[PDB]
From a paper:
These membrane proteins belong to a subfamily of the resistance-nodulation cell division (RND) superfamily of transporters and are critical for mycobacterial physiology and pathogenesis, with several of these transporters involved in the export of fatty acids and lipid components to the cell envelope. Mycobacteria secrete mycobactin (Mbt) and carboxymycobactin (Cmb), siderophores with an extremely high affinity for Fe(III), via the [name] and [name] transporters to recruit this important metal that is essential for growth and survival. According to the protein sequence alignment with MmpL3, it is speculated that both [name] and [name] are proton motive force (PMF)-dependent transporters that function via a proton/substrate antiport mechanism.
However, only [name] appears to confer increased resistance to bedaquiline, an FDA approved anti-TB drug. Within the transmembrane domain of the [name] transporter, the conserved residues that make up the proton-relay network are also residues D278, Y279, D851, and Y852.
Author numbering:
A (entry chain A): 22 to 494, 693 to 956
B (entry chain B): 2 to 84
Write the structure that this text describes.
């Protein structure tokens, strides 16, 4: 009595395959490609409720000059000191920038105004910068469009001899990051397919079965990318470059892994002397639930990212889960159908090398005879990666994570060749009141606030109405001197209800010291306004330093919450399948332990060998996939253990090793190397996350599954399957005749 | 109380799974490391399966002492008669 589901798949293999390919083609043709959809559906880098963006937006609103929260800086560099022709060029550029109303919202002209010209010019006089407030929050499609428009306006124009204009800033860096990721996705896909083709030829030694698994991989990846593009195009969710890169790589990896699992079980059944129909049914009965649970675990683990706060991690959640579900559905339905329809034709899927697994016999014997020593060695090898924690540091500047020739990087280099980091990252603070603050009393109150901000350590200059160029400037005639009017216009609200300060740190503001100094300035301003008519006022502070402070605050929450959610959900799924609490706990805890080795290898390769420290994003993006895939491999091994345990513990384990040793090792290798294949991307952080996941899965395939979990199972014995009741060894059988 | 022939049949089945050597090649005279080219590790797998399926426990220390099939049967014969 064949089960109804594999029978249905086998009997209607051709209609199922045709329906799958038709649906995939419709998905991939109706909507634009994943590159275009990801470009249109780019999301803002920072949360909409972040204090920094809210402060910048409030400053723009009260001053009625812009509505955005992100700005870029146009740096003018010349071989000789800038003069009259450079000033005319700058004035024309500023006028043209202000002309583009839809993209450019406000241009803060400080160099042109003689009152604050000295602050916008380098001490060598060969450089000058202007802050331009582009439309759209950083990271959005509108922000990228505005960055492109500003770059075109500043660059594509006549220039004085020796004078060049560069556009830099966080928004430009994000735009170039997404551009580089989308450009490198094609190379990533090509290299990944070449690598998996070579390794499938190595592990199968047959071109036909390699083509079959490549067809399954193509179907799964096309379905995943098509459904993600279809849902993104209709604004179901946002997208990032990280989301698309992870979607395509994970789709390829999981499709290859499920194809490897199914074909390996089918070929083992054939090797055990079974006809094609019986072998197919055995393969389904032994692998369908395993691959279903693998897909469910990966999808749910990625979906756990949907409950974080940072937009870049939160956005990645749903698309990854949906792609994971679609690829596991394709592998579960089109997989067996393809396998049957191709095994019906000659020696198509028959095993090529009719060779046993001697080494897996040896390692199974070793792990069931001396579990303690092997377990101790494996635990030590997993924990040896923890000694790299003390030397682990993460940086937040994206300068080194992009190619040295992108326009953002060259603008960054030009700006830092003449200006300090504090100048290029000013911190903006304003005080909002309900009164007209154009009186001498309010004026020296503002002066006192500026002095209080200045007295805080680590602060270099404070620009305001009283100190237009960072230094103090009361004559009643001076209030209408045509210079105080301009200073008030540039530093005070049009209705005079708010006053703006431009705090410039002393040193590097983009660091934890800058984050502490932010609260220091907030406290200093609060103290300054105390006991004054400005007491009933609201204080807003923003800037690049504040934005990175918010990001730093978020990062720990994201890491902890995604790790905990993925852990709990994976453990729940393992309990549901294996029906054993201890086995599920072992499966989860083994990869939890291996995470240390994964992290150690990653920071050994990047921080020390390559020299580029790990980005702050790589670990949260990598832990989820590491846990999911490692738990999947352990689950496959444990399910085979449960299948073979009727012969008794300590021999069912050996049979599980010799049964799912080569296939699972090949799957782990292909997954690890296809994730490492993203190291070819121009965006360094994509390569970092890919290589981190690759090293972690390499360690999981080589150690935590071949040595850790079987030794744990042997040590626990009957208790490994608790609360299920199993015997340590079967009833002693009489010696056969 | 199992006879010598019955133990041979049980061992040969374990031999087939562990190594792949045909049951016919297994006779009490053939040596594990000279004739049957069975390494020490493969002997451990043999002991594990026999201890599980038949209950005869052979520790690691005594495993090196056994050299051919005959003394393995004698070891198993010794264990069952003591009972
Ligand atoms: C392993 C052995 C049976 C002798 O080694 P061998 O079987 O390779 O000839 C004996 O030294 C032993 O029992 N050692 C205890 C565990 C050990 O030494 N190594 C386990 C990892 S291979």
């Amino acid at each position: 009595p064949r089960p109804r589901l594999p029978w249905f798949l086998r009997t209607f293999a051709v209609p199922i395959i045709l329906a799958w390919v038709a649906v995939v083609a419709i998905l991939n043709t109706v909507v634009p490609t994943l590159d275009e959809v990801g470009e249109m559906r780019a999301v803002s880098m920072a949360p909409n409720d972040a204090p920094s963006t809210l402060a910048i937006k409030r400053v723009g609103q009260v001053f009625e000059e812009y509505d955005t929260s992100s700005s870029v800086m146009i740096v003018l560099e010349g071989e000789e000191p800038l003069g009259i022709e450079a000033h005319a060029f700058y004035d024309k550029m500023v006028a043209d920038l202000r002309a583009d109303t839809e993209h450019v919202q406000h241009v803060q002209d400080f160099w042109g105004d003689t009152l604050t010209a000295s602050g916008a010019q380098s001490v060598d006089g060969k450089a000058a910068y202007v802050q331009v407030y582009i439309a759209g929050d950083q990271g959005e499609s509108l922000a990228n469009e505005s960055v492109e428009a500003v770059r075109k306006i500043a660059t594509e124009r006549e220039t004085p001899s020796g004078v060049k204009a560069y556009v830099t800033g966080a928004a430009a860096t994000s735009a170039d990051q997404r551009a580089e990721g989308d450009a490198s996705m094609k190379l990533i896909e090509g290299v990944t397919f070449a690598v998996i083709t070579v390794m499938l030829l190595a592990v199968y030694r047959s071109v036909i079965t390699t083509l079959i698994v490549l067809a399954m991989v193509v179907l799964g990846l096309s379905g995943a990318r098509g459904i993600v593009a279809f849902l993104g195009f209709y604004n179901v969710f946002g997208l990032t470059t990280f989301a698309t890169n992870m979607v395509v790589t994970l789709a390829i990896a999981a499709a290859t892994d499920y194809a490897i699992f199914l074909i390996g079980r089918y070929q083992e059944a054939r090797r055990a002397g079974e006809d094609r129909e019986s072998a197919y049914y055995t393969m389904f009965h032994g692998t369908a639930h395993v691959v279903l649970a693998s897909g469910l675990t990966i999808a749910g683990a990625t979906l756990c990212l949907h409950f974080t706060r940072l937009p870049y991690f939160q956005t990645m959640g749903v698309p990854l889960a949906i792609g994971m579900l679609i690829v596991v559905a394709a592998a579960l339905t089109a997989g067996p159908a393809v396998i049957s329809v191709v095994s019906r034709f000659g020696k198509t899927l028959e095993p090529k090398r009719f060779s046993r697994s001697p080494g897996w016999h040896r390692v199974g014997t070793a792990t069931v005879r001396w579990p303690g020593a092997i377990l101790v060695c494996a635990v030590v090898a997993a924990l040896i990666g923890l000694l790299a924690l003390p030397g682990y540091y993460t940086t937040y500047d994206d300068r080194r994570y992009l190619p040295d020739d992108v326009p953002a990087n060259v603008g960054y280099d030009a700006a830092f060749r003449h200006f300090s980091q504090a100048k290029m990252n000013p911190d903006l603070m304003m005080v909002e009141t309900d009164r007209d603050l154009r009186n001498p009393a309010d004026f020296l109150v503002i002066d006192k606030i500026a002095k209080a901000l200045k007295n805080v350590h680590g602060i270099a200059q404070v620009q305001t109405i009283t100190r237009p160029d960072g230094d103090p400037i009361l004559p009643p005639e001076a209030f209408e001197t045509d210079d105080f009017q301009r200073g008030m216009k540039l530093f005070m609200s049009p209705d005079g209800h708010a006053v703006r300060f431009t705090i410039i740190h002393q040193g590097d503001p983009l660091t934890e010291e800058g984050t502490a100094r932010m609260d220091e300035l907030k406290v200093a301003a609060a103290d300054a306004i105390k006991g004054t008519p400005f007491e009933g006022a609201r204080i807003y502070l923003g800037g690049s330093a504040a934005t990175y402070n918010d990001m730093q605050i978020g990062a720990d929450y994201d890491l902890i919450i995604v790790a905990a959610s993925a852990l709990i959900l994976i453990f729940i799924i393992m309990m549901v399948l294996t029906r054993a609490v201890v086995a599920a706990a072992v499966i989860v805890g083994t990869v939890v332990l291996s995470l240390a080795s994964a992290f150690g290898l990653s920071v050994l390769l990047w921080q020390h060998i390559v020299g580029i420290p790990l980005h702050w994003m790589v670990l949260p993006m990598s832990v989820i996939v590491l846990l999911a895939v490692g738990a999947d491999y352990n689950l496959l091994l444990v399910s085979r253990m449960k299948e073979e345990i009727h012969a008794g513990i300590r021999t069912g384990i050996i049979r599980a090793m010799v049964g799912t040793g080569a296939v699972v090792t090949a799957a782990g290798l292909v997954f690890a190397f296809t994730m490492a294949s993203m190291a070819v991307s121009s965006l360094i952080t994509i390569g970092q996350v890919g290589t981190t996941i690759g090293l972690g899965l390499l360690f999981d395939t080589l150690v935590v599954r071949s040595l850790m979990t079987p030794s744990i199972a042997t040590l626990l014995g009957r208790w490994f399957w608790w609360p299920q009741r199993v015997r340590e060894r079967p009833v002693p059988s009489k010696w056969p005749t | 109380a199992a006879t010598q022939e019955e133990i041979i049949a049980g061992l040969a089945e374990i031999i087939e799974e562990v190594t792949g050597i045909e049951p016919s090649e297994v006779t009490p005279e053939k040596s594990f490391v000279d004739d049957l080219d069975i390494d020490s590790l493969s002997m451990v797998e043999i002991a594990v399966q026999t201890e599980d399926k038949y209950g005869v426990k052979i520790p690691d220390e005594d495993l090196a002492g056994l050299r051919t099939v005959g003394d393995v049967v004698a070891y198993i014969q010794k264990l069952e008669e003591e009972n």
